[PDB]
Amino acid sequence: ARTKQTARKSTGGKAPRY
Amino acid sequence: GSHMGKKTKRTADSSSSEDEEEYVVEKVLDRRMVKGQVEYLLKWKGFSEEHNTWEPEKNLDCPELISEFMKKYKKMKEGENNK
């Protein structure tokens, strides 16, 4: 079971051309 | 004023399964800034400082860890007392 705040390793990263 | 016509709307995913994927943080270890970005050394469940894992402020979901950390760090470095 999970209760405490937990997230996966690194999210939020766009892959632009430049 | 009386209760008439009630509404209910809830959403939830049905995924009854357990597996090692997500990692939990223990506490802050060190702090460093690079490329105009501040990062903090966090320890994940099972992982040790040996891996030297850094996490960005944005991802950093534990401010209290830093608040207290600063207290100890302060003593480490030689500064001045103020109230």
* Chain A: residue whose CA lies nearest to B45: A6
CA distance A11 to A16: 15
Chains A, B: CB pairs < 8 Å = 21
How big is the CA angle at B73 (ends B67 and B56), to the nearest 5 degrees? 55
A12 with B59: Cβ contact below 8 A: yes
Element at B76 (helix H, strand E): helix B63-76
Q: Do A7 and B59 touch (CB under 8 A)?
A: yes
> Under the phi-then-psi rule, with left for phi > 0, alpha for psi from -120 to 50, and beta for the rest, what region is B4?
beta
Query: What's the distance, CA A13 to chain centroid?
Result: 9
Neighbours of B13 (CB within 10 A): 4
Torsions phi, psi of B24, nearest 5?
A: -105, 140
- Using what technique was this structure determined? NMR
Which 8-state DSSP code applies to residue B50?
A: G
Q: Per residue in B45-62, is it b (16+ CB within 10 Å) or e — as a string?
A: eeeeeeeebbbeeebbee
Q: Are B39 and B54 in contact (CB under 8 A)?
A: yes
Q: Are B26 and B38 contacting, i.e. CB atoms less than 8 angstroms apart?
A: no
